[model samples]
Target: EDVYQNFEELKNNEDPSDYGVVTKETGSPVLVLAIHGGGIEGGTSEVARELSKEYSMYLFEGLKSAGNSVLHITSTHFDEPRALKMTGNHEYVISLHGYAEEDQQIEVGGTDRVRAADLVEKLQHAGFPAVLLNMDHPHAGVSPNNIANKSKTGLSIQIEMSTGFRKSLFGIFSLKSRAVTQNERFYEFTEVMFRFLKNSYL
Candidate 1:
């Protein structure tokens, strides 16, 4: 499969850990991931790390690789063992990603429609425009083998954020900017989601 090809290609060329892809164990049933982490999709890894800490959830972050700044493995194509291992143990998997579009909205999708709806409602109430994608949409992330869906519970949530929204959280910086580490809104946004995730699932 082309997807697997991309996976192998990335692995053959780069070391994910050297780039920052790390999996933390928290012994929680919930897992969070930022497969397009680092400069590729800014703020995702930061958010995932924070939520994992707050909710005691496992974390799997795919940090950016060298030279290949734009290289990204599609959701269904992601086959990192650390992420898969975390998924195997967790009952809920929530993935955060950055969309290429400039829209100031969040596209909610995944196998867990109910949980996705819950997240969208919470985000909208918090003043963020969020929309649920149609199940048939190509990027809806509903596939059985989607990285988000490869969990023990068989249900997962994926939130794709537009450039405008990500900018609001971390400012408009270069794709290679270390803004993910320097921005203040990173924590603010993470806290809001943390509150929602903690209250929603429990």
Candidate 2:
């Protein structure tokens, strides 16, 4: 039910002042994306930005004052050219997204089953309630066209963190509040991710 079917359509219709595409390339094999970032899905930009400290990153973030959902371009249909090019070049692509559940939970899904499974297990080991996504979960991210799966290896990671998880990661979870309030849990979570990605990726 997205209003835009492609990046072009979304870009053409939205105000440039309401959104931003941020990219930082470190020439690393890893690329982390937060395509539904900012108000579109909360906390993803923060998480992806932290992950980018050790990798390349791309964020298509909504800066709208409100109702950012209108800025969401579903994953399967997100074909922002620069995003595609970055994902295409990387050996590993990790997409971080926000999920709708009010309860705390972490969902991992992607074309890379091995990594997804390990990531879920890792999160659970760290005491986060984590699950591998339902095969057809709303944001399961298994579609071949999903930007996360566009990597050179054809394997990728998609992480969907529930609202509650995001809420707990910061002192307050609103878009504006999150800008300055990422807490220790945030670092712990990203550390786990960084460890896995750095120590394990081929």
Candidate 3:
């Protein structure tokens, strides 16, 4: 009983606040990452929560500007959901979280998929409907993973989103009501993302 309890304690004791990254001994040029704001420390809600509005699009915009292949990583370890990793030599990762119980919503994230400058232009052109993307102090969820190490090999991206953006009874129920919304802006985001991915791979 004692051993079992300790095991449970260790597993449950993992905090969502702390995060880190280390390099593999034998490295290749691939972006390895963690996507969720939650980890062994605390949740990256401060910045992650804000990105819920346009993170995926933002990431696509960022990805377009990359000079090399990219790797995306999922940091979200809470959910048992699985995403494709190690796409070719590049790792694509996404951390999914949302607000709202059983309803439609959006997922958020970031990346170098498109040039950051072009991304800003597109974001500016569209006149983002919500302040979610305009939040100040965006440094909250950004953490150090083997991104730097992977930098020499390939571009790496870590995407995090608010739990309220998507429809998940398990996660949404815990979020603030006003923070959740089903109305997603995908077209404008897609416009830039398409070009971004194209350029990144080129």
Candidate 4:
């Protein structure tokens, strides 16, 4: 179970060295988020960082040596102050997360149906396995309270990459290696995402 109810509870018990929240705003309307980042969800943070280069970003990573899941607070329950402020300022929000599955798949879901559908098509055409989430996806970014959905447009996209797919993006899927050790597949995927996001930002 999620060890804490919200950011405040987790902050009181967790050390900075074990977990962290980082944000950068470049006056861009797009906001990239990785709440279950770092060791908590492996490649999610790396993807967030890459997207952050051209847009705003907020990352809450887990630096624990083990048991990173305990740091994962659901998007709706996530109440990090900096994250909320950034989300409020943005026109669009895109959040990355990892799911517990062995399949090499990407599930897109959220309030932004157009963007989500187009992104999935883009990824699929680029040779990545991506699909849109069905109506009842539990983690879908549908709730108004969800951090990603709290933007100015109240529409956001959530990308859920399976463990197998995320692991494929890195040469060495370890806490220390991650972004630094991203492999060729990662670069290819980045290119595809960059093109898609570039169009969306327009």
Tens-digit lDDT string for candidate 4 (1-202): 6889999999998887899889998988889889999998899999888877777899999999999889999998999999989999999998999999998999999999888999999999899999898558886779988889888999888999999999999888998888788889988988888898889877
Span of ten consecutive residues with least summed lDDT in model 2: 133-142
Comparing 2 with 3 on lDDT, the higher-scoring candidate is 2
Q: Model 2, stretches more than 4 Å misplaced?
A: 134-138
The segments of candidate 4 whose C-alpha lies over 4 angstroms from its true place after superposition are none
C-alpha lDDT of all candidate models, in order: 0.71, 0.87, 0.29, 0.89
| C-alpha TM-score for every candidate | 0.83, 0.95, 0.32, 0.97
RMSD of each: 3.0, 1.3, 13.5, 1.0
Q: Which stretches of candidate 1 lie over 4 Å from their true place?
A: 1-6, 15-18, 56-70, 171-184
**Model 3 Cα displacement at 7 (Å)?**
15
Colliding pairs, model 1? none
Please provide, for model 2 over 115-140, each residue's C-alpha lDDT reduced to its tens digit, 9 standing for 90 to 100.
88888888889888889975677667
Better of 2 and 4 by TM-score: 4
Each candidate's number of clashing pairs is: 0, 0, 41, 0
- What order do you get sorting by lDDT, best first? 4, 2, 1, 3
Candidate 1 lDDT at 124 equals 82
Highest lDDT model number: 4
